[PDB]
Design a binder for this molecule. Sequence first.
Ligand SMILES: [Ca+2]
Ligand SMILES: [Ca+2]
Lengths: 157, 157
Amino acid sequence: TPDANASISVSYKCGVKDGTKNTIRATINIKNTGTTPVNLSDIKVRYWFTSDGNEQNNFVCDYAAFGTDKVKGIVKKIENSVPGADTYCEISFTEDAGRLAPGGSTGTIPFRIEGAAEYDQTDDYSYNSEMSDDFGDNTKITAYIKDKLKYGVEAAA
Amino acid sequence: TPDANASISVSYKCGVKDGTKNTIRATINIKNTGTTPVNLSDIKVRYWFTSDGNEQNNFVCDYAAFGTDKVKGIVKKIENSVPGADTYCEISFTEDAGRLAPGGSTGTIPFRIEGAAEYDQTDDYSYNSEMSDDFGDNTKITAYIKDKLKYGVEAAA
Ligand SMILES: [Ca+2]
Ligand SMILES: [Ca+2]
């Protein structure tokens, strides 16, 4: 089917951490790997993690070529937690965000997930410190077109 | 310098030809390979060719994610022709075309160069029929940021 044929990939770079240790930093780059355009409004990305007691976990996008105001994020609890995830951050795009041509991509989209208390990122499904120096194929980040899985493997028991 | 550090690459796919043989078809995909954004308005691309007697050679862009109305082309004669080129088509972008984030790209930008009489593309510097099945690194197409060469090798005696 036409929807079956749409394809995207995501690349990832692990950000920096300091001393307060209450900020998850990462950058993603979403590519249209198919032969027809994709609307950004149809794309969602999930970052799976353990919130380490933080009830409040706030998403911020710090840059996007098409404007930070096009990028949305919600952080939700997982009821039946799984290895590396009791929470996920779901990144999405506004209706007016634009579209990716075949072979096109967003380029860097850096974001933060902010908590009051410290995050230990080592016990997060989507965290991969091996991808700090260069963008890599972090298949523990998932992406969706019209709510159908197109990239990565979901955290799961 | 900051300008020195900006970088782009271009990938290319050779289009189709038939029977009238008076249309050059190609697709390009421009990528920001640097670590700071690039404005599309600062980018130019040149396709170098022999016009085979055609005095009139018309550029058309058939698709772009950001709109065909953002893409401009002019075809100019080369006074002191060189191997594979007595003409070039210079593709550029409007002030409002948008920008490429680091790691971003345009995706497919198909275009045509239209002539009244037949083109023989085999004697064109920028033509590479080996890149018909997949996008490739056609370094006989040049690209520029603020009129400074950033990709490819210009046709030259
Ligand atoms: Ca954690
Ligand atoms: Ca020719």
